[PDB]
Amino acid sequence: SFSGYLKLTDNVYIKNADIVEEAKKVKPTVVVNAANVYLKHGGGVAGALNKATNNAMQVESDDYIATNGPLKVGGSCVLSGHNLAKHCLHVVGPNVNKGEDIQLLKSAYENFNQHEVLLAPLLSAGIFGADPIHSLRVCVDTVRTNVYLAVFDKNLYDKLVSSF
Numbered sequence: 560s561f562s563g564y565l566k567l568t569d570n571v572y573i574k575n576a577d578i579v580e581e582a583k584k585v586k587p588t589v590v591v592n593a594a595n596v597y598l599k600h601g602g603g604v605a606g607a608l609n610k611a612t613n614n615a616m617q618v619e620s621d622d623y624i625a626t627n628g629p630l631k632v633g634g635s636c637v638l639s640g641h642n643l644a645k646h647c648l649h650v651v652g653p654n655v656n657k658g659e660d661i662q663l664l665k666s667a668y669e670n671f672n673q674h675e676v677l678l679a680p681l682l683s684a685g686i687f688g689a690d691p692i693h694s695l696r697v698c699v700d701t702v703r704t705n706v707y708l709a710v711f712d713k714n715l716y717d718k719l720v721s722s723f
């Protein structure tokens with residue numbers, strides 16, 4: 560049910576939208592979370608997704624961490640999407656602000672290829688320190704499944720589209 564997306568490639572689409580409001584409107588099979596290895600959903604996409612689930616995402620995440628330990632940088636896990644989606648694919652992109660290797664961003668995007676269609680943010684951008692133009696390039700060059708990108712900042716959306 561995605562609408563108002565601009566087509567970038569055969570499988571990559573983009574919209575200036577809040578991923579939480581997109582998830583509520585569409586109820587996608589998969590919503591991607593921009594997670595950290597601990598699944599501590601404090602801010603950004605994670606804090607926003609968590610708050611929309613009334614903290615049910617954090618409770619579920621803490622139980623997952625208690626059982627399995629932390630995720631790898633570039634890794635992922637599939638948990639419930641609660642009221643936003645059937646599933647939430649928690650993906651850990653490298654945090655450039657913590658000295659994490661930017662090459663792990665390709666590995667993080669590879670997790671998207673296990674799902675036919677996903678609603679997602681740009682990985683490693685925002686508070687994770689990577690260049691969003693670089694993140695979009697890696698997305699297009701790595702993801703083969705149908706990905707619908709929600710870009711929150713209008714000025715960033717315009718820059719991403721005009722430079723692609």
Ligand SMILES: COc1ccc([C@@H](Cc2nnn[nH]2)NC(=O)c2ncnc3[nH]ccc23)cc1
Pocket residue numbers: 576577578579593594603604607680681682683684685686687709710711712715
């Ligand atoms: C920690 O990794 C991050 C990854 C991406 C991000 C940024 C990248 C970005 N910056 N301007 N639009 N996009 N995205 C969001 O914060 C974002 N995107 C879509 N819908 C949203 N609703 C609430 C937040 C939000 C930050 C952090």
